[PDB]
């Protein structure tokens with residue numbers, strides 16, 4: 116009850132900023148996450164005996180892959196933390212509880228391969244869930260860990276509060292399927308421009324929570340340049356690995372994943388910032404003005420990639 120977590124001063128200050136990096140010390144990430152729940156939700160939201168055992172179970176069910184790892188789960192969780200703290204009064208008690216757990220769980224038991232690669236491999240998980248394949252799996256694995264003796268961090272919720280929080284988490288994890296992002300942003304775009312966006316419309320909060328999740332999951336591109344650049348290596352190490360496995364199934368992989376076309380990479384970063392990253396945080400900024408620092412950071416980094424091409428690094 117009376118046991119706060121307390122970070123070193125530099126972390127105590129930087130963590131509140133959007134562009135904070137959670138650092139190379141694995142053992143401090145659970146403290147960081149727990150810190151963010153207490154400040155975001157209340158000291159009282161979850162039993163600490165139980166939260167700690169849910170954290171360490173989730174930590175274990177992320178694999179040792181180059182990008183889609185435990186450091187991603189906490190990084191994404193942190194960016195939602197920043198969004199929630201800068202939009203204090205826009206979100207229910209339940210949404211703040213469910214959304215931080217969603218982000219920590221959003222990529223559970225990821226193997227470093229796209230939904231596309233699962234379908235062309237004929238992995239079983241592709242037979243079991245035709246669309247948003249990894250994403251239905253991640254939610255699945257989330258409800259597993261919630262149901263281990265001693266891991267139900269929600270058991271003090273009422274029947275119907277519990278039913279709402281599991282429904283928030285599911286939509287949130289499904290919304291991380293980038294394939295559904297493009298359609299979701301467009302609807303939110305029209306709704307904000309035609310003035311029809313209504314945050315008490317539940318189907319509308321859903322859409323907005325969808326965009327938030329996309330923005331947190333892409334937040335790699337919203338860090339200072341040297342974090343963005345070094346993360347790109349991790350992202351591309353999975354992509355080229357999947358390309359290698361595409362080639363083993365006798366398919367030429369798309370250039371994004373072909374290690375032979377590293378040269379074309381800076382240009383592929385341009386298309387990505389232009390087609391996905393910039394729009395995402397633009398639309399987010401319009402709906403949630405306090406999230407403008409993400410948009411600014413993303414633009415600074417688009418500008419760093421333009422330099423990489425122009426020979427200037």
Ligand SMILES: CNC(=O)c1cc2[nH]c(-c3ccccc3)nc2cc1NC(=O)c1nc(C)ccc1C
Nearest residue numbers: 332333335336350370371376379380383384387391
């Ligand atoms: C949907 N589209 C994308 O995700 C994309 C497409 C690309 N095409 C090329 C490319 C390369 C060499 C030659 C031609 C083309 N690089 C690409 C990188 C991409 N994404 C990320 O970097 C990326 N993806 C996530 C989910 C989080 C962060 C990042 C930073």
Ligand SMILES: [Mg+2]
Nearest residue numbers: 221222249291
């Ligand atoms: Mg994912």
Ligand SMILES: [Zn+2]
Nearest residue numbers: 187221222332
């Ligand atoms: Zn992710």
